[PDB]
Design a protein around this motif. Structure first.
Motif, short mmCIF file in Angstrom:
data_model
loop_
_atom_site.label_atom_id
_atom_site.label_comp_id
_atom_site.label_asym_id
_atom_site.label_seq_id
_atom_site.Cartn_x
_atom_site.Cartn_y
_atom_site.Cartn_z
N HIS A 103 5.47 15.76 -3.13
CA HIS A 103 4.70 15.83 -1.94
C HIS A 103 4.13 14.48 -1.54
O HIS A 103 3.16 14.41 -0.77
N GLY A 104 4.73 13.41 -2.00
CA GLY A 104 4.20 12.07 -1.81
C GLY A 104 4.95 11.27 -0.79
O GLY A 104 5.65 11.75 0.08
N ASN A 105 4.80 9.96 -0.90
CA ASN A 105 5.28 8.99 0.04
C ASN A 105 6.65 8.46 -0.22
O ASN A 105 7.18 7.74 0.62
N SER B 231 -1.26 4.65 4.51
CA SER B 231 -1.79 4.22 3.24
C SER B 231 -1.76 2.72 3.07
O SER B 231 -2.73 2.14 2.64
N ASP C 200 1.89 3.56 -4.12
CA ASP C 200 0.65 3.92 -3.53
C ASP C 200 -0.51 2.96 -3.88
O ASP C 200 -1.68 3.30 -3.75
N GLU C 201 -0.14 1.76 -4.30
CA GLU C 201 -1.11 0.77 -4.72
C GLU C 201 -0.86 -0.54 -4.03
O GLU C 201 0.29 -0.88 -3.70
N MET D 221 -3.52 12.04 -0.38
CA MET D 221 -2.18 12.61 -0.17
C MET D 221 -1.74 12.38 1.24
O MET D 221 -2.54 12.13 2.14
N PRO D 222 -0.42 12.40 1.49
CA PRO D 222 0.06 12.03 2.83
C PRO D 222 -0.53 12.79 3.98
O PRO D 222 -0.85 12.13 5.02
#
Ligand SMILES: Cc1cc2c3c(c1C)C(C)(C)CC=[N+]3c1c([nH]c(=O)[nH]c1=O)N2C[C@H](O)[C@H](O)[C@H](O)COP(=O)(O)O
Ligand SMILES: Cc1cc2c3c(c1C)C(C)(C)CC=[N+]3c1c([nH]c(=O)[nH]c1=O)N2C[C@H](O)[C@H](O)[C@H](O)COP(=O)(O)O
Ligand SMILES: C/C(=C\c1ccccc1)C(=O)O
Ligand SMILES: C/C(=C\c1ccccc1)C(=O)O
Ligand SMILES: [K+]
Ligand SMILES: [K+]
Ligand SMILES: [K+]
Ligand SMILES: [K+]
Ligand SMILES: [Mn+2]
Ligand SMILES: [Mn+2]
Lengths: 500, 500
Positions: free
Chosen positions: A442-444, B373, B424-425, B459-460
């Motif tokens: 469910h992520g990017n 993000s 995600d960083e 989360m997205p």
């Protein structure tokens, strides 16, 4: 029968341990059983045995929740797991994992076929059962079906007969005579299913046994090697050949004392809606149904007064943490050692939602390798993340000999203070990823690839000359005689039991 | 005098709270006082008051350990901090941090000069004291000196007179009349020292006051803005002007009820050996001595029966965690809001060794920003990591509205399950780094630059349409009426107090 060899005896053992609450008044399988179990798991309470389940008929079924969850006290925290294995209830995680690894350099002890067992006490043919009429639980309010299968063992065999796999994979009721479930790579149920699909001739003979010998359900949850029949591994671990009985409608063999057995086929062609399900990482995504594998049930056999074990899985702590994470860690430890890496211990911290594994390094051995962090991290990550044992794990944390990897506070301390973000890490984007982690599926990014990291929490001198610090803690910052004086005078001065 | 305005009253308050152990038998300042305090801090026990210190003469000194450490019970866990601020002992961290931020949009209330106070009860000129003859503690066995200064407030003023800074910075005894200590960028003591060095004409007039008003020591530990005189901030926070008395040998002003005051100069030219010291991240590196700033002491004044507060700092939990981390987090929250970022809450998890700050996002506001993000992480990290309030923090974790950032279990859950490593960083290599973290000053890269990261645990759909999951937990996976039934029947069925 001993507790580790017979689920009915295991339940007795829990009672004798004062680790069981029997609930003899009516309980609804629609959410109530699972809510009680969820609360047990979040609080490390006694396991619930639901003896009066609403919709129970003709002996199907009672429910045991939280079979592999934690106890409150520190001294016997892993006692329920110890009871799966004939270990003392005070056994450490190291002792539990060592027991689970013990069979890896033993000859298998193949199973023994017996003519009957308790699992044959009652039967229902395909004109006499309806899965939609059984007291199958709704485990989470948003689940996409009633998950009958959360703690049974799927049994499938390679087409050539040479490998019989036992594993846990979830499954839910589809209709009167079918289930849907997860059958995903690189899992052995999937690997065997692919063998039958390539052959293309028939559906896969299958059985699902609930309330199996506890030592067997532990092996069912562990990523022992490809091609290794779990029954023989469990025989070697326990020192005894497991007693199995033939299915009635096919030639697979199930544990003689299984509580409930479903016999049928796993389709090589058909699918059906499956999920969503409230999962090990703590989430459910309502409405995310996808096509899963489809199982046809032809026969049910079961013990008198059959008991169905259930995992009410989700946020900490339940079987998906205690068993999936710890058993994967065990296998990773062995894999590392077999690849000549200087790893002494491994554990999946519960605080990481069992997405990390901390690897304790023998730093004397490391020093002799005359290597660097960059090189060592890459070696470790290549070995682990390219192997099935590493599937579920997205972060490896390397720590030196002062850290007890079974203590999450210490792992978090080392990670936070010894691993420089970025510089001391290696990312792995070209490895299989675990889609069930929310940041994956469910992520990017791609659900099935990447998202893994090796975090080196070894300090520089650990690769060269040795540890060059002392902890700023009571243990390390004060001499022995002083410490003991303080302890001996503690209550005398005015300041504040192991078992609890 | 109220407890928040007078250290002697604070000690009384701890006694009345049943949060104090008075030790009236002889205790050695060489390690024993600090060992007892260390054990207190590791166990969240009562604060120790050492009334009979070996080497105490002519009223110098008693020791209070663990002044800002944690209590055992959940209900009053932060009670010692609450007692610094006139808050109820059950105050939440949010309430404590809000109190510490309250003065940021109030007019200062400047201090009031009074002719005398308790701090003038006794004095010792430069022919009558020797710092090496006082019962200064050795705090950790490998420390490079006796750290007199772990919970006093340094007072220095800009050359132009317009800014008087109060702050905690460590210092140890060098010789009979000098200390050495840390004076490092970007800290205000360093910024003021640089102003005097550029002027080049004299050493910096200085005072060090121990056992100051508790509300003042909290502000001393907080990174309030450049150029803001702490005394006026504390006056606004407390609603009262602080009473100060002039030093005897210079024109600085100290709290009237200070327990012990050192008067002298901070050199613009001289240095001396300083360290090592067992530090907030949990380590000491024996033998790592380096040149530090050098202070000359010309006069000591002190209360009758003076009490020196002491922090026995190291592994969790002590003042370096409760105060440094939490107060930095508070300032970061405000900084983010002032930069139009949708942050509601901030806290430095203790599990991170206060090297992380978790930032709770108002996701309704985030959605209206119509961002991503990558963009959002960069904005947040630029604001925080380019500012002094972010100095000590190496990882920012962004979390949505469902996460209580004051609960480390929840922060760890979100980080581990919602932030895909790497993708995600955003890493920050061109920012000031905190060299005291072992992976910085004793690590593989530059001690003073980089090593920072923003980890996005949003989360997205939190950026677009809203949260699309429910937790697989008791709270969220079951309807209200069911939950309440389970709770109401809990003890009835057989399963297992707020204050505790
Ligand atoms: C303990 C345990 C293990 C589950 C599991 C659960 C539990 C309680 C559930 C039922 C509550 C939720 C889902 N689980 C699945 C699962 N593996 C998989 O492929 N699909 C699953 O649905 N596993 C993990 C699987 O059992 C291990 O990865 C094994 O190593 C698989 O055996 P194998 O190595 O022979 O393939
Ligand atoms: C609570 C607390 C804060 C320490 C501290 C300790 C404690 C108990 C010690 C004494 C036990 C160990 C060392 N500490 C130092 C320190 N800051 C610094 O520059 N040098 C230090 O040696 N700090 C942090 C410093 O007080 C905060 O960063 C302030 O924001 C500094 O004030 P300023 O913003 O006015 O510069
Ligand atoms: C976690 C999970 C399945 C899984 C677990 C481990 C390995 C593969 C799949 C589930 O069914 O919810
Ligand atoms: C932690 C520490 C100093 C420090 C802390 C925060 C900011 C700057 C320096 C010490 O003196 O041990
Ligand atoms: K298995
Ligand atoms: K490292
Ligand atoms: K300050
Ligand atoms: K994310
Ligand atoms: Mn297998
Ligand atoms: Mn300041």
């Amino acid at each position: 029968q001993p507790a580790h060899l017979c689920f009915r005896s295991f339940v007795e053992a829990l009672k004798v341990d004062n680790d069981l609450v029997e609930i003899n008044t009516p309980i609804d399988p629609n959410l109530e059983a699972a809510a009680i179990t969820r609360r047990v798991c979040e609080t490390n309470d006694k396991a619930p045995l639901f003896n009066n389940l609403i919709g129970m008929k003709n002996g199907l079924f009672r429910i045991l929740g939280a079979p592999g969850s934690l106890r409150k006290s520190s001294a016997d925290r892993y006692g329920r797991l110890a009871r799966h294995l004939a270990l003392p209830p005070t056994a450490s995680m190291r002792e539990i994992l060592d027991k689970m690894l013990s069979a890896s350099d033993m000859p298998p002890i193949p199973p023994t076929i017996v003519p009957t067992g308790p699992c044959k006490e009652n039967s229902l043919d395909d004109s006499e059962f309806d899965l939609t009429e059984l007291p199958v639980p709704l485990i989470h309010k948003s689940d996409g079906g009633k998950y009958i299968q959360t703690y049974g063992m799927h049994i499938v065999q390679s087409p050539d007969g040479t490998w019989t796999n036992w594993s846990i994979a979830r499954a839910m009721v589809h209709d009167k005579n079918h289930l849907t479930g997860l059958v995903i790579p690189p899992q052995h149920i999937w690997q065997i299913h692919q063998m039958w699909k390539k052959e293309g001739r028939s559906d896969v003979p299958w059985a699902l046994a609930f309330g199996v010998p506890p030592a067997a359900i532990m092996a069912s949850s562990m990523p022992i090697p490809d091609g290794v029949t779990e029954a023989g591994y469990v025989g070697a671990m326990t020192g005894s050949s497991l007693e199995l009985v033939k299915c009635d409608t096919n030639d697979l063999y199930v544990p003689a004392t299984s509580e409930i057995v479903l016999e049928g086929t796993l389709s090589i062609s058909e699918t059906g809606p499956e999920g969503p399900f409230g999962e090990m990482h703590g989430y459910i995504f309502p409405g995310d149904t996808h096509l899963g594998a489809k199982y046809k049930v032809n026969r049910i056999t079961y013990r008198n007064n059959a008991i169905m074990p259930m995992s009410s899985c989700g946020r900490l702590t339940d079987e998906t943490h205690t068993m999936i994470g710890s058993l994967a860690a065990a296998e990773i430890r062995k894999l590392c050692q077999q690849n000549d890496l200087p790893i002494t211990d491994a554990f999946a911290p519960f605080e990481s939602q069992v997405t990390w594994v901390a690897l304790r390094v023998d730093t004397e051995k490391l020093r002799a390798m005359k290597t660097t962090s960059e090189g060592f991290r890459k070696r470790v990550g290549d070995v682990v993340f390219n192997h099935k044992a590493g599937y579920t794990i997205h972060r490896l944390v390397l720590v030196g000999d002062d850290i007890d990897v079974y203590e999450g506070k210490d792992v978090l301390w080392a990670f936070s203070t010894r691993c420089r973000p970025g510089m001391d890490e290696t990312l792995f984007e070209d490895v299989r990823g675990f889609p069930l982690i929310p940041y994956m599926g469910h992520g990017n990014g791609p659900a099935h690839r990447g998202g893994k990291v090796v975090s080196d929490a070894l300090m520089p001198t650990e690769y060269t000359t040795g540890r060059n610090w002392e902890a700023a803690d009571f243990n390390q910052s004060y001499p022995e005689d002083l410490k003991q004086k303080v302890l001996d005078n503690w209550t005398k001065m005015g300041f504040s039991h192991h078992h609890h």
